[PDB]
Design a protein around this ligand. Structure first.
Ligand code: 8GI
Ligand code: ADP
Lengths: 1010, 129, 130
């Protein structure tokens, strides 16, 4: 009953059009009864039923408007409307009106002054009070749990605008979206999207970011104030079999004595859960566990609760943020769809100094120590992943409390850890009576059980089992600076999971306190096996946290010379036999199975990088010529550069985007498989757009100079692949100088599908002139143009007979280049195969391409002209080419329209006995049944041909029939025939199998056949 | 299948079973008295996991002649075991048909060489060149 | 000068410089060409080409990069007497290379056109030693 307008509008709809015209006329001519003012003619006629009801209310008021309608209905003789108007008396409240500034007939009128505020207070009782009680409390509460110890006392001061390159859809816009609208999609795209995930290396600070991201928005702070609630949850407390509800999970964040969860159960998608660390999840977890959960309040299993939450089947609109370890992605990625992947990176060179600006309190402390990092560039490139920088500054700070710094010997990640320990174990460790080495084993034993039994939060319950629960650990706690207070209730933990995995690696070498100590604090059992083979056998299991650092730290630890005068509490021949065991682990991985979760080739290269000295690493590196790796940061480039410094003779190197390597199949000779188009689907025009505005100031002459300096020292390397790489022309110049080196020895080089252009073609032409030993080049799908062809040709004709093949398709080449390609081929000695299809040459372009082919010097054999746009007019030329050429044997023309007129000349083009054609492609050529008889006549009369393809053409039932007559003509000593992609009925297949059964000599294949 | 002495063919393309069901299928032909010669499992929503299981039967089963498994999660590792099938000389199968899944060079790489090696078994790869 | 030529021509002009030799002076000013052109023109300047003494290259929309190129040719040029490269986008960063080449006695250059190049005071410390 809120609106009379709506009721009046409904009555206006009921009125017939003639009655409505009479109603409008009566409203305009309304008599002066009950102080009612008649509506103006223009307004009444133009207004629709809803507008006229609003205009009637606006003109006199709701009560008068209804009264006028009742009289008008009687006047227009609409008895049913008149009876209905008398029957229904609406309440005079009012409808929605855009009268923000109130207006009245009196000159004073009305305003948006205090009167409005008073009216609002009088009518508004619940909404505002409820909103206020829900807000302030939650905010201040989420705000006061991260400060004010008496180092975690200032956090925003420790901000940095950490890198946030959010994965562009995996099949160029910048849009860093660091804080504002980071969850928000692009224009529409996906409004109800809820899942965002952060990918960062272990120790980057993804745990820190959530605390900061909370701290930012926990004061509004111009963050997503259009979003109401945020929920922080770190999975240290969360465990399996907890059988706790979401409300129990929710009340964990803020233990309200009177949980308002019934009001927290409000406005889904208005609340955000900040889940933290999938790696923190300890225990088994089926990504597709059987039992399903949809109840919000039911006491469900901890993983099951997450399972529903991760799938969002419970709380279908709830937003989610999940910091995840890259190695653990495949579990959740298979589990959940449309994830907003966000790559997060550590501090840069200058940012690393800027961190010391946050950290240090004096330049003589800051500037002097930082200056050491620049000289120690190996440490400097290692000074990524800010956790290591925390180790660097803190450890050096303590050294300044006792002495002056040095080269720091921190050439590796492990070297960073051990140097930190050496300063750590200074005061009491040196004395044997207070020697903490046995206690170091005690915490290592606890550390080993930390993942072997998945209990990070050991608490006093288990520390007493592992060591001196009160006296000794208090020093370690104060040395570790955080082992209990993170949980804040009773539980005890460690600083970070790297330390636990670091000590887990130490115990393996320490022979578990040797075989001459033991003295366990009640631990007769629960000792994880001192064997390391099981470690590699459980390696990669989420049950054991993928065991990265445990394995990774083993390599760095076993450095004989380094730990010899560092510890003297070291391993024995056990480590030496461990190396052979670890050698076998690396050996089997490359040889046996390449398809595994993620034992990456670079990941192994990290391992060999830790283990310095040549021979062991050399044996391991010589277990794989198949090197296919991806690089993200200088450290990744450095380790890849360093590891390849070892060994030699390595066959193939692979880099770049990859993950799919089509459209590059080699054919060699006498193959049953040829190069075919792929083009992918999604690159479209986006690939060209990225090639122009790539920018990427973080990629420079560096990241490449060192890596290719290894390639300059290839030492009998043969093959290099650079497909799909975003490597531009400057990097291409560096690669060309690298190739110029006499010791490059590279045989084949692939750079297809990249973004190169003409400046490079100047540099690539110089490379062709200097390498000579280069036998094959692939420049396909690289948008270069014709000038490039001109420069490449002056290259092809100097110390360059050896080049036999060249892939140049889709290089956005115009016809002009054909004048260039002719002259080189007019002089080329040993150019065997040419692939120039799919470019813009046209029949005009090939008109030159046929002139060059008349000479006997043309040692070309194959010809790739597929999808070139040629037409029938060019066939008259190439027809003479085939007869006059003594070396061409293959021609590929799929997708290019010729028509039977052109194909007619093709038969004549092979009519001459001196033709040496063996392979021809004519699929999708726009061919009809008419020419099939003509080509068939040649096929019987031609002995040189071996295989032919003719699909996607008007072969027809009659045309395909003649292939039977081909069989009936015993001269059909052909080797293969391929037809496909056309639907027919039974008879086409009917003769097929019988004659295929009859004929073993000819490999006839029908792709759509059963 | 074990209790029937006459059924020899079964066609199941497009029907979702999953590796759990296919697991029982190997057991369903585990009995020596099985006379299955043809089975269709294309588009069955199958993963690489069960491929090892069915392969074990294929070597240990002589009654089967032809099998189809396309449009399923065979994977590089799964299709690899077909080489081990060849390396197990008990692979006196008559045909095998896989199709409709895109892979890179290595899947095709071993294919032609072992097809060249093996004239006994008519292995066919429809999307192959 | 003042024409609309670009880099493809600079490949052809470099070939012309290599073949003419008797050419003693070239003016390419106000021709919007860029740096690749300078690279190709330099391989021309250093073959059967000591005789070239003057070269006008102002307003050719040249970036600093070309300076690495102009140095090497001048590092080897026999009888290049005058150079006009002003008004292009070299900057103090660009001339930082342009000063390195000028230290050798082989530098038979006499004039230098750097007007309106956008250089600042920071580059003076270099050319002072030059
Ligand atoms: C690409 C791939 C597979 O190697 C990878 C991507 O992320 C990881 S990770 O294992 O989970 N995280 C880390 O390794 N962090 C890390 C790194 C270095 C040194 C240190 C740390 C932690 C403290 C010391 C060097 C570079 C990486 C591995
Ligand atoms: N933005 C940052 N500023 C300063 N230090 C940081 C930052 N991010 C991470 N750290 C350092 O990293 C350590 C914690 O890293 P963490 O968040 O656990 O990384 P991850 O979650 O990837 O393991 C802290 O000791 C801290 O010094």
């Amino acid at each position: 009953m809120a609106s009379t307008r709506c009721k009046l509008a409904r009555y206006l709809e009921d009125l017939e059009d003639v009655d409505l015209k009479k109603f409008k006329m009566h409203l305009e001519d309304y008599p002066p009864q009950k102080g009612c003012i008649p509506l103006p003619r223009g307004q009444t006629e133009k207004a629709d039923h809803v507008d006229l009801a609003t205009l009637m209310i606006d003109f006199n008021g709701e009560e008068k408007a209804w009264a006028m309608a009742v009289w008008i209905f009687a006047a227009i003789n609409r008895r049913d409307l008149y009876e209905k108007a008398k029957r229904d008396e609406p309440k005079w409240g009012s409808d929605n009106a855009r009268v923000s500034n109130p207006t009245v007939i009196c000159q004073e009128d009305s305003i948006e002054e205090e009167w409005m505020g008073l009216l609002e207070y009088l009518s508004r009782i619940s909404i505002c009070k409820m909103k206020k009680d829900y807000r302030k409390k939650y905010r201040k509460y989420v705000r006061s749990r991260f400060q004010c110890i008496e180092e975690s006392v200032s956090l925003n001061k420790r901000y940095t605008r950490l890198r946030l390159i959010k994965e562009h859809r995996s099949q160029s816009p910048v849009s860093p979206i660091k804080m504002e609208l980071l969850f928000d999609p692009d224009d529409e795209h996906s409004e109800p999207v809820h899942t965002v995930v952060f990918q960062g290396a272990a120790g980057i600070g993804k745990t820190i970011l959530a605390r900061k991201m909370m701290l930012d928005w926990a004061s509004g702070t111009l963050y997503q104030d259009r979003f109401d609630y945020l929920f922080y949850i770190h999975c240290r407390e969360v465990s399996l079999v907890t059988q706790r509800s979401l409300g129990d999970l929710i009340m964990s964040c803020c233990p309200d004595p009177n949980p308002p969860i019934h009001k927290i159960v409000r406005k889904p998608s208005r609340i955000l859960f900040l889940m933290d660390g999938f790696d923190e999840l300890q225990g088994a977890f089926d990504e597709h566990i059987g039992p399903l959960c949809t109840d919000w309040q039911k006491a469900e299993r901890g993983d099951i609760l997450l399972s529903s939450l991760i799938r969002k089947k419970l709380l279908p609109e709830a937003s989610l943020l999940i910091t995840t370890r890259p190695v653990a992605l495949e579990k959740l990625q298979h589990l959940l769809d449309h994830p907003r992947h966000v790559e997060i990176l550590g501090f840069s060179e200058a940012k690393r100094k800027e961190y010391f600006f946050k950290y240090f309190s004096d330049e003589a402390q800051a500037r002097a120590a930082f200056s050491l990092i620049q000289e120690n560039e190996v440490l400097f490139t290692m000074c990524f992943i800010p956790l290591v920088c925390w180790i660097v500054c803190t450890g050096l700070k303590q050294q300044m409390e006792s002495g002056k710094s040095l080269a720091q010997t921190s050439k590796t990640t492990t070297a960073v850890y051990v140097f930190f320990l050496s300063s750590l174990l200074q005061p009491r460790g040196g004395s044997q009576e207070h020697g903490l080495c046995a206690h170091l084993w005690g915490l290592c034993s606890l550390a080993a059980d930390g993942i072997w039994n998945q209990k990070i939060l050991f608490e006093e319950s288990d520390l007493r089992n592992h060591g001196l629960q009160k006296a000794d650990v208090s020093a370690f706690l104060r040395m570790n600076l955080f082992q209990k207070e993170v949980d804040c209730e009773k539980f005890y933990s460690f600083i970070h999971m790297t330390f636990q995995e670091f000590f887990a690696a130490m115990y393996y070498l320490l022979e578990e306190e040797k075989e001459g100590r033991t003295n366990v604090p009640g631990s007769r059992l629960k000792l994880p096996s001192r064997d390391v083979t099981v470690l590699l056998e459980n390696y990669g299991k989420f049950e054991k946290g993928y065991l990265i650092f445990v394995v990774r730290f083993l390599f760095g630890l076993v450095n004989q010379e380094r730990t010899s005068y560092l510890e003297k509490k070291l391993s024995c021949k056990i480590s030496q036999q461990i190396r052979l065991e670890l050698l076998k682990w690396i050996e089997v991985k490359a040889k046996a199975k390449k398809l595994q979760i993620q034992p990456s080739q670079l990941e192994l290269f990290y391992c060999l990088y830790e283990m310095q000295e040549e021979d062991f690493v050399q044996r391991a590196m010589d277990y794989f010529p198949k090197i296919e790796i991806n690089l993200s940061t200088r450290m990744d480039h450095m380790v890849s550069s360093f590891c390849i410094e070892n060994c030699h003779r390595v066959e193939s190197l692979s880099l770049g985007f990859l993950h799919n390597m089509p459209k590059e199949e080699e054919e060699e000779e006498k193959e049953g498989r040829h190069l075919d188009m792929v083009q992918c689907v999604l690159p479209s025009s986006s690939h060209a757009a990225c090639s122009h505005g790539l920018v990427n100031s973080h990629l420079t002459s560096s990241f490449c100079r060192g890596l290719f300096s290894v390639l300059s020292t290839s030492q009998s390397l043969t093959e290099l692949d650079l497909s799909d790489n975003s490597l531009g022309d400057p990097g291409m110049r560096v690669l060309c100088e690298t190739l110029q080196h006499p010791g490059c020895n590279i045989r084949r080089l692939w750079l297809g599908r990249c973004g190169l252009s003409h400046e490079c073609c100047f540099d690539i032409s110089l490379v062709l002139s200097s390498n000579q030993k280069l036998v094959e080049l692939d420049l396909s799908d690289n948008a270069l143009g014709d000038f490039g062809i001109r420069l490449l040709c002056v290259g092809l004709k100097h110390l360059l007979c050896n080049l036999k093949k060249l892939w140049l398709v889709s290089c956005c080449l115009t016809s002009a280049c054909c004048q260039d390609l002719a002259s080189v081929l007019s002089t080329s000695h040993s150019l065997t195969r040419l692939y120039v299809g799919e470019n813009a040459l046209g029949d005009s372009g090939v008109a030159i391409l046929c002139e060059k082919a008349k000479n006997p010097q043309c040692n070309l054999q194959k010809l790739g002209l597929v999808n070139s746009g040629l037409t029938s007019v060019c066939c008259s030329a190439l027809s003479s080419v085939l007869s006059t050429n003594q070396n061409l044997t293959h021609l590929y023309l799929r997708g290019n329209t010729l028509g039977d007129k052109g194909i007619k000349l093709l038969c004549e083009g092979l009519l001459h006995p001196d033709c040496k054609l063996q392979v021809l492609e004519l699929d999708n050529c726009n061919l009809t049944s008419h020419c099939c008889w003509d080509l068939s006549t040649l096929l019987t009369s031609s002995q040189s041909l071996r295989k032919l393809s003719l699909g996607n053409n008007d072969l027809g039932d009659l045309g395909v029939m003649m292939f039977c007559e081909v069989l009936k003509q015993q001269s059909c000593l052909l080797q293969n025939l391929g037809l496909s992609e056309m639907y027919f009925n039974y008879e086409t297949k009917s003769a097929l199998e019988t004659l295929q059964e009859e004929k073993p000599e000819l490999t006839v294949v029908f792709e759509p056949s059963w």
